[PDB]
Structure formats: structure tokens, C-alpha cells
Design an enzyme around this catalytic site. Structure first.
Site, short mmCIF file in Angstrom:
data_model
loop_
_atom_site.label_atom_id
_atom_site.label_comp_id
_atom_site.label_asym_id
_atom_site.label_seq_id
_atom_site.Cartn_x
_atom_site.Cartn_y
_atom_site.Cartn_z
N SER H 6 22.20 -36.48 39.06
CA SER H 6 21.12 -36.66 38.08
C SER H 6 20.06 -35.64 38.46
O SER H 6 19.27 -35.87 39.38
CB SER H 6 20.56 -38.07 38.09
N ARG H 7 20.03 -34.51 37.75
CA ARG H 7 19.15 -33.42 38.15
C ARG H 7 17.70 -33.64 37.76
O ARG H 7 16.86 -32.77 38.04
CB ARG H 7 19.64 -32.10 37.57
N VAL H 8 17.36 -34.76 37.12
CA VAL H 8 15.96 -35.11 36.92
C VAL H 8 15.48 -36.08 38.00
O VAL H 8 14.26 -36.14 38.26
CB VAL H 8 15.75 -35.70 35.51
#
Lengths: 277, 52, 156, 177, 140, 140, 52, 140, 52
Positions: H6-8
Site C-alpha cells: 500500500s504505497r499510500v
């Protein structure tokens, strides 16, 4: 086909993960077995300065012992002394002597009946399963005293370092049968000692040879047990390496077959669209 | 090779100045022999790998 | 893959076929030597992966007998060609058909287990593997003291 | 009497008559000891080298001027240029003294060698140090041992060995300072 | 070296290099052969460890810097200096400097006789062995 | 044998051959899984080693020279000779000669009544039990 | 793979799926012996990397 | 976990879960290298076995049943019950029951002030250790 | 697999030099000084050659 290499990749990717775990297992066993080899190396010394070391004697009956490993992923250890125990059993008998061959470890019987089928009489195995003790080596010693030879030969790998394991011949003479006879050098070399036993010298030498046999055998299967863990640490750093170079050549060949599969599928779709359009 | 070469050959040092390009490179399917990175790698004069 | 091993001609022996390899055509003992050679080479081919990762020291004695026998017949199938002596130096060898049947019958039975592997490499027949081993043995026993210079102060 | 001079270097040449040369001559336990027995020296006046050894552990390689060993004839004492003595030891206390301080192990029984070069070699199996013995089980163990009078010779050899180790342990746990 | 080949090749090379580099590609063949099997560090024959130390010297002998080509006469003397044992016991971190010393300290006339004859004549290898004995190799 | 299927199956098999094929299909199923453990003849087990040789008697039983088809009754006797263990004494390398010894030395009337009865009758599997004992098998 | 072992019907136990395997539908006593068999058979598949 | 990103999520979650999910992201990451290493449990180091016992404690805690989503304040305390101590004694087979033990037994007014504040305040941190000690874990 | 105290006396210097190389390649950035407080520093090429 293009999945036959994809399934072959995950096979070799886990072999390089399994044999990396067996190497760090065998390196953790080798570091704590090493603290017991030096403590067993001390008691060997007073017997070889009291009784010398006479490997080429004129015995009429002998018991040779080749101390090998139980498990067989060691890499040139259990057959190396099998090369040496055939080189010793071609050295001693040039005069028609008796020889009884004993191997310690499952990899010893499985390679001594290959060379020496008739003089092999006893197989000790499952020695290194929990740990090696002196009471365990004493019962292995006692069954070598059920046979009553003039000498004993022990063949084991001495743990010099984590690299070199020089195979040692360690030998024990029988007390008033042959040990007293080799000491008769211009009189005797044993008469300098004043025996403080309860009984006379042939009975104190009987107790002393059995105590010499029990420690030379206990040190043999401690030197050979961590020469096995260090050989297993080096046989699995060559195997994790070789299964990483094999996996490196399999992912390159899969990536060629991956790229060739997309070009083949595409050309067949363009050839079918151009036939209609 | 001529679409990339049409872009990358305008990035150079002339006698008036230079354009120096920092290009983020994605490698498809972790294959360096794929034609999109292997044509891009012909123009690269340096790589800067940022690792976790 | 065979040519990168230096085996020349680089013939895949487990991939080369003929309709003459038939015991009613070439004879009974030619056919059995040929099928016996291919069985040793196939059995060694089946062992290539476990030798690659586990090593030589983990096979059976029955396996590592055929690993040494198939490494002997792999080199023995190679041969110096008379048209290749311009760039390799080694003279060519026209091996007769009886010389290669009885030469390869000896390796399968075990008559030459004691010879080294490289004695089989680039030789004509089963005599020249015995002469190459003697030459190989002589080379590692050949040694001269002060190496017979007589080069300094050569008279006119 | 000396019609076969064997040895480690003599095993080199005969094995170089009958073995393949691609194996080198194997090593021997003689090669890994630096102190022999017949050679003159290593007493230097007061302190001789002692070597108290068990199979599982090395307990002293130091130098003492005196050792008291519990022989089967009784507790003798090894001084510096002592006579060569291969002495069997009963269950008793080995006292290693280098001066006022004393390290006293109760041993299970096993030989002690004084050599022609003054070096003492105590070789026991079990060495119970006198501060770690159980003083509550020394008396409970001899009681069943003195009453077990069986009919087999093996346990009669084992019961006679049983009380004599315990009885010399009562006398080795009471009068300690 | 195991894969690079020249079909036409030996029919069209320098006759000095043709009689020097024959034992160069042979000894580099064994060094490829030994260090394909002695990767593990298993054991040493002290002749395989000899060709491991000889093949490491021929490899450094064939290293070369960029934009500095060498004439063929200064090349075949440098291969003569390394295959005929004159660069023995020189350490493998010094042979780049050592045959820079060989080419610079040997008389320039040896390169001129070899360039014009095209071949190491018996009067020349007698004289070239002499001029390689008189070479201040680094480290000795 | 693993990938080969017949979806008619033993519904259209010669009886007698069908009686002996179940012992042959089962033992070759165990001989295949015991393989990829057969590279360790040091590692004897004597239960796997029992079937590692028994299936290998069956494997070299099924070998056959070409352009010589066998009658079906001579085949089911040769599978009977290896599933009931008559050829356990012979080595693995000499069963193709032993199958000749089974065929050429029994009474050739055992094949005449097996073809007519169509199955190995109870009045035959004790006839040909002792018939494969009065043959000499090349292994001892 | 199951049929090469001779096991018939050659139903792959770790590839056959039903919507009926909700414990709301077949009950939790059937659901746990089904999930437990799939757990012990996936573990054996994870252990054949060593014991083969 | 090794492939799902989850790159956020670098500070885009519940702050109370972010207290403990960062350690769970490391303590499960060290487990993933040594999981396929030590498939055996025979001969283990005293350091890597603790990763294999904690990482197997962390895996069983994260699995959950279908159609029962948990509030975020109640999965925060179940990761806090596994990131900290409190669960290093249930085997592997009881952590499914040991977690719902923690959800049942713990005073549910810590959920009202974990969810309202959003993070584990140090007053609530001390009551969280005390409430997670009077629980009756089904390891028995 | 073996330990920090295992390897040679010269190779403790290699672990000493490389670990202080690994920190010396680190650098605070002038753009990050707003959310990390510490200012950023431009290292000249002549400094980082001679400093390393």
C-alpha cells in the site's frame, strides 16, 4: 514446457533455501561440538606418552575401526577414510594376521562391505543422535574387547580447523599380549614406573589399555562428529552456490521463453487479422 | 529504438549548454533483457539505484 | 553444449539416430556396444542435476562407476580430424570400424577403469589411449636437473 | 626383545610400499603432543607440570609444586622430582596445591601417572568439586547399598564399588574448612 | 578464450607469435580447466596449483589498457617473457608493471630484428633469453 | 507406463494376462516412486530395496526386440514368471536371456491349452508352477 | 498428479472448491474436518520439499 | 505480505494501529526469510527460533473468519496483544481462541477511549498492560 | 553463521572502515531541512574525493 521451467525454478529456489538452512544448522552444531573436542583432546595425551604410538606392529589379531558419519551429506568424509582404511589394511597384513573390521556410523557399513566383506563383523550406528558420551564410547570399547586382539586401529578425521580434517590412525596395543613386548627395548621402558596398583603390573596394564581404548574412541567420535558438521557446512555452501547459479540460468532461460511466447502469440494474432482485413 | 532514440538524442550537451536527464527506469517482469529497458539502457550514462 | 566441453566432433550421441543401428544390419556385437554406450551416457545424463547441486561425493558406488565410465566414453567419442589439423596441430585419425567397436567394448566391460579420463581425449583408437596415458604419466615424471642450457657462449 | 622398531615415522615408509601415493601418510596421535616422558627437563626446582583430566573437561594444565592423590594404597603426595609412578586411584580427593590456596576435587577413580620427566598426569572420569557435592544424598545412598546383599557376582562387584565411593565421600564432606 | 576463435586465424599470424602463443593458449586452456574444477578449494596437487599460478600470470599478461595499442614485436616478446618462465615468481599484482619493465629494459634492437625477420631465429632466442635475464623485475 | 492409458482398459484384455497384469501394474507403480531415491545403494532399506529390484525384474521383462511380436500366451507366462517371483534369483542384467530360458525350456503344451482355455485355469497354474521350476535360469 | 499415485477419483483436494463450504450452510462440525484435512494436506505439500 | 503493497500507507492509517503495525511489519518480515529456511524444527539456533515462534504467533493472529469485520480499535489491541508479550505462551493452535479471549475478557471501555483518541496514550498504555494480564487465555 | 569475534584482526579494520564509509555516504539535504530541522550541506567534489 514453458511451465516445465517455471516449476523447475521454484524447485531449485527452495533447494537453495533448504541447503542454506542446513548450512547454518551445521555451522551452529560445529561451533558447540568444537567446545567438546578440545576438552576430549586432553585426556588422549597422557596415554600416548605412556604407551608411545606404534602403528606398524606385528599383531596376529587386530580390530580396525573406521569412524564415519551417520548421515551422508558430508562430502568426501566417509569415503576418505575408507580410502585410508583400505590403505592401512593393505599395509599391516603382509604376514597372515587376523583382522576384524568395525565401522561407526551408517555411512561406514555401507562403504566397508563394498571393500571388506568377510572381515567386517560389527556395525555401530546412531551414535551422534543425541550426543556422544564417555559411557557410550565405553560400551563400544568393551565389544572391541570381546574380540581379544594384539592391537586396535582407530580411523577418524581429526578436526584441525574448519577446513582441514586430516585422517588420523590411532592405535592401542593389548597389555601383556603385545604392549609389554614392544616396550622391551634393552630391558624394558616400563620398569622405570613404580606401580601403585593393588595387583601386579599385567592387571594394571589391562585396566590402563581399556581406559586408553575408551578415550581414544571417545575422542575419535568427537573429532569426527564436528569434522562432519564442518564438512556439512562446506558441502552446503557449495550446494547453495550451485543451486543459485543453476537458478540464475533458469530465470534467464524462462525470460527468453516468456518473451518468445508473447512474440509467438502476437504474430499468430496479426497473421489471423491480416487474413481477414 | 527510434522513438526512444528520438527523445533521448535531444538530451545532450551542445555548445550553448546541456540538458542532463534523470529518468526513472521501470523494468517489466524483472527482466533486464526486455526490449523496453534494454533499449533504454543503451542511452544511460549512469544508474542510481535506490534500495530499501 | 558438447562443443563447449571441447569434445570434437560435437555429436550428441543421445540424439543421433540411424536406420543402420539395427542388429540385423550392422551385426550383433556392433549393435550391443552402441546400445551399451548410449545406456551409460543416458544414465549419466539422468545424474547431471544431482551431481550439479549435491556433488560427486553423494552418489552410490554403482552410480559413480558409470559417471567415470561415461566421462571416459564422452572423451573417447571425440577424435582429431585430418581437415582440422591446420588450426589445431593434432594430426587426424582415420579409426577403423573394428577399432572403435573393440575400443568401446573395452570401456563398457571395465578393462580401462584405471586409465585417466584425459587419455581418452582426442585419440584415434584404444591403442592410443594406452600410449597417451604412458605419455601423460611420463610427462609428470619427466624432470631434469639444471635443464641442459649450453646456450651461453656458443662458439661463433 | 626389540625385534620390531615401530613408530609414527616408521609407519610412513612401509605404507609407502603398499598404498596409493595419491593419499598422503595419515597422521598419528603422537604428532599432536608436545610433551613426552623420557626426555630430560620440565621440573625446574619447585613446580612440575600437572595435568588433571576428565573425558568431558580439562580441569588443570597449570604448574604445582605438590599434588596429593588418593591411591589404592592410600593418599600419597607427588613432590617435584618424584619417582615415576603409574598409580591407580580409588574414589578419593585430589588436592592440587601451588601454595596456601587449595583446589580439592573429589574424583570417581582413575589413574595418575608421574613420568620420568617429572610431569604428573591425573586421569579420572568424574571429578566432583567438594563445594558442589550433595551432603544429603551421601548418607541416603549408602543405606540401600549396605543392605543390598545379592546373589550375583556382578552386583557384588558393583555394590562393593558402590559403598567405597560413598564412604570416602562422607569422610570428604565433613571436616572441610 | 574458451569460445573466441579465428577460423582463418593461425594461417595468417605473426610467425614469432605463432611459435610463442601456441603454448599460451594451451596453458590458458588448463587454467580454465583447473579453475573450473578447483572452484571449491578441495585439494591441491602442487602441479595444478602450479598452473593456477602460471595461468594467473598469463591472464595479467594479456590485460591491456585502452587507447594504447602495442606493436606485434613488443607483443610477442612480452608473451615470450611470460611463457618461457622469465616472469615466474613475479606477483600477479605486478605483471602490468613487470612487462612494462620487460619492454622498456630490453634493447630496442631485439624488437627490430624480430620485426624484420618476422620470426624468432635461433640466433635471436639465444640473444633474447640473455636480454630477459638482465631485466630488473619488480620485487625479485 | 505412467502416462500411458487405455480407456477400454482391462475390459478387453486377454484373461490370464489380466490375472498377472494387476501384479505387474501395481509393482511398477511402486518401482516408479522408489525411483528418485535409487541413487543411494549405500542406503539399503530391504523393503524399498525389495521392490527396487522386483520392479526392475518387471522393467527388463517388458523389453522386446523389434519385428518379432510374441504370441499373447507366451507373454502372460513370462509375466507370470516374474510376478510370482520365479525370476527373483536372476540378476537384473540377464532377464532378457532368462525370458528365453522360460520360453524355450517349458513344455510347449502349456501354451496350447492356455490359448484354448483363455485363462490360467486352476488345473494349469499348478502345472506351470512346477514347469517353471524344471527350467534353468541364467542367474546363480 | 493424484492419478499418478493411483488414487481414484483423482480429485485435487487443494484445488476443489465449493460455495457450500460456508459453516453457515453445512455446519461447523463438517466445516472443521474439511478445513482441517486441507490444512494437513497443504502442510504435507510444504514438507515434501525436504522429505522427498 | 511479501508482495502486497500500500504505497499510500506510510502514515495513512489509524494512529493507534500505526503504533504496533510498524513492529508487526518488521517482525513478520524477519519471519518470512527464516520460514522456508527452517521448515524443520529439529536443530535450531536460540535466535532464529524466537523469530519462528513469534512469526507463527503473528500469522495466526491476523487470520479471521468471513463476514465478520472487526472495528479498528479491537484489532489494534489484538496486534498489541501479539506485538508485545501476552501471547508468547499459547501454542499456535489457540491464538485464534486467545485473541477472542482478549476481545471478550478485556474491559471494553478501553475500546471507547482508544477509538475516540485515535492512539494509545500512555495512561491507556499502562491500563492496556494491566487489562491484558487478568485475561484467561485458553492455553491450558 | 559464526560471529563478530570470528574473523581476522585485519578484517575488523574492514568492518571498521566500511561502516564509517556507509555513514559517510549519508548526507542531510537542504530540501529536507524544513521537516527534519537540521540544515543540508552541499559537498564539493574536491572535498568528497579527499575526505573519502
Amino acid at each position: 514446457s514453458n511451465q516445465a521451467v517455471k516449476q523447475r525454478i521454484r524447485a531449485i529456489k527452495n533447494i537453495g533455501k533448504i541447503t542454506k538452512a542446513m548450512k547454518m544448522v551445521a555451522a551452529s552444531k560445529m561451533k558447540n561440538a568444537q567446545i567438546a573436542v578440545e576438552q576430549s583432546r586432553g585426556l588422549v595425551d597422557p596415554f600416548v606418552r605412556l604407551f608411545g604410538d606404534f602403528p606398524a606392529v606385528n599383531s596376529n589379531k587386530s580390530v580396525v575401526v573406521a569412524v564415519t558419519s551417520d548421515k551422508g551429506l558430508c562430502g568426501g568424509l566417509n569415503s576418505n577414510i575408507t580410502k585410508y582404511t583400505r590403505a592401512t589394511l593393505a599395509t599391516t597384513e603382509s604376514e597372515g594376521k587376523d583382522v576384524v573390521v568395525v565401522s561407526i556410523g551408517d555411512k561406514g557399513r555401507s562403504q566397508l562391505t563394498r571393500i571388506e566383506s568377510q572381515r567386517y563383523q560389527l556395525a555401530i550406528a546412531d551414535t551422534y543422535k543425541v550426543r556422544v558420551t564417555f559411557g557410550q564410547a565405553s560400551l563400544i570399547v568393551e565389544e572391541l574387547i570381546k574380540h581379544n586382539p594384539q592391537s586396535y586401529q582407530i580411523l577418524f578425521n581429526k578436526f584441525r580447523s574448519a577446513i582441514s580434517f586430516k585422517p588420523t590412525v590411532a592405535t592401542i596395543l593389548s597389555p601383556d599380549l603385545l604392549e609389554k613386548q614392544l616396550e622391551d627395548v634393552t630391558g624394558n621402558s616400563l620398569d622405570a614406573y613404580d606401580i601403585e596398583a593393588s595387583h601386579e603390573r599385567s592387571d594394571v596394564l589391562r585396566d590402563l589399555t581399556e581406559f586408553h581404548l575408551g578415550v581414544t574412541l571417545y575422542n575419535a567420535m568427537l573429532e569426527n562428529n564436528c569434522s562432519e558438521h564442518a564438512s556439512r557446512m562446506s558441502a552446503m555452501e557449495n550446494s547453495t552456490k550451485s543451486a543459485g547459479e543453476m537458478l540464475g540460468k533458469l530465470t534467464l532461460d524462462y525470460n527468453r521463453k516468456r518473451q518468445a511466447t508473447i512474440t509467438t502469440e502476437l504474430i499468430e494474432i496479426i497473421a489471423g487479422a491480416s487474413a481477414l482485413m | 529504438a527510434t522513438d526512444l532514440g528520438g527523445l533521448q538524442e535531444r538530451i545532450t550537451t551542445t555548445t550553448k549548454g546541456s540538458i542532463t536527464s534523470v529518468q526513472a527506469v521501470y523494468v517489466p517482469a524483472d527482466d533486464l533483457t526486455d526490449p523496453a529497458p534494454a533499449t533504454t539502457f543503451a542511452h544511460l550514462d549512469a544508474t542510481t539505484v535506490l534500495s530499501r | 553444449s558438447i562443443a563447449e566441453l571441447g569434445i570434437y566432433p560435437a555429436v550428441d550421441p543421445l540424439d543421433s539416430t540411424s536406420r543402420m543401428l539395427n542388429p540385423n544390419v550392422i551385426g550383433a556385437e556392433h549393435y550391443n556396444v552402441a546400445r551399451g554406450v548410449q545406456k551409460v551416457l543416458q544414465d549419466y545424463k539422468n545424474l547431471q542435476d544431482i551431481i550439479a547441486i549435491l556433488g560427486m561425493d553423494e552418489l552410490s558406488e554403482e552410480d559413480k562407476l558409470t559417471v567415470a565410465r561415461a566421462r571416459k566414453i564422452q572423451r573417447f567419442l571425440s577424435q582429431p580430424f585430418q581437415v582440422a589439423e591446420v588450426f589445431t596441430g593434432t594430426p587426424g585419425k582415420y579409426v577403423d570400424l573394428a577399432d572403435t567397436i573393440s575400443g568401446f567394448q573395452g570401456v563398457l566391460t571395465g578393462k580401462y577403469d584405471d586409465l585417466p579420463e584425459m587419455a581418452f581425449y582426442m585419440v584415434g583408437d584404444i591403442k592410443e589411449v594406452k600410449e597417451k596415458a604412458d605419455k601423460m604419466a611420463k610427462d609428470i615424471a619427466s624432470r631434469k636437473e639444471a635443464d641442459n642450457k649450453k646456450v651461453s657462449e656458443e662458439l661463433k | 626383545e626389540a625385534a620390531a622398531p615401530a613408530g609414527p615415522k616408521e609407519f610412513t615408509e612401509v605404507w609407502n610400499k603398499k598404498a596409493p601415493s595419491t593419499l598422503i601418510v595419515p597422521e598419528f596421535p603422537s604428532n599432536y603432543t608436545a610433551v613426552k616422558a623420557v626426555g630430560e627437563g620440565q621440573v625446574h626446582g619447585d613446580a612440575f607440570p600437572v595435568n588433571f583430566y576428565t573425558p568431558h573437561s580439562i580441569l588443570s594444565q597449570a604448574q604445582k609444586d605438590t599434588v596429593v592423590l588418593p591411591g589404592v594404597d592410600g593418599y600419597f603426595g607427588v613432590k617435584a622430582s618424584h619417582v615415576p609412578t603409574i598409580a591407580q586411584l580409588k574414589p578419593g580427593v585430589v588436592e592440587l596445591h601451588s601454595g596456601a590456596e587449595s583446589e580439592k576435587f573429589f574424583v570417581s577413580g582413575g589413574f595418575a601417572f608421574v613420568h620420568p620427566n617429572g610431569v604428573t598426569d591425573i586421569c579420572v572420569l568424574e571429578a566432583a568439586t567438594l563445594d558442589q557435592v550433595d551432603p544429603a544424598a551421601v548418607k541416603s545412598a549408602l543405606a540401600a547399598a549396605s543392605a543390598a546383599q545379592p546373589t550375583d557376582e556382578f552386583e557384588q562387584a558393583a555394590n562393593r564399588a558402590a559403598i567405597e565411593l560413598y564412604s570416602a565421600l562422607e569422610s570428604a564432606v565433613e571436616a572441610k574448612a | 578464450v574458451g569460445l573466441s576463435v579465428s577460423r582463418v586465424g593461425s594461417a595468417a599470424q605473426f610467425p614469432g607469435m605463432k611459435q610463442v602463443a601456441g603454448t599460451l593458449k594451451l596453458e590458458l586452456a588448463q587454467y580454465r580447466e583447473v579453475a573450473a574444477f578447483a572452484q571449491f578449494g578441495s585439494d591441491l596437487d602442487a602441479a595444478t596449483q602450479y598452473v593456477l599460478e602460471r595461468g594467473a600470470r598469463l591472464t595479467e599478461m594479456l590485460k591491456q589498457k585502452q587507447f594504447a595499442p602495442i606493436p606485434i614485436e613488443r607483443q610477442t616478446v612480452a608473451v615470450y617473457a611470460a611463457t618461457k618462465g622469465f616472469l615466474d615468481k613475479v606477483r600477479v599484482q605486478d605483471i602490468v608493471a613487470a612487462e612494462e619493465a620487460v619492454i622498456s629494459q630490453v634493447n630496442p634492437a631485439v624488437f627490430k630484428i624480430l620485426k624484420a625477420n618476422g620470426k624468432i631465429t635461433p640466433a635471436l632466442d639465444a640473444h633474447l633469453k640473455a636480454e630477459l635475464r638482465k631485466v630488473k623485475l619488480p620485487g625479485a
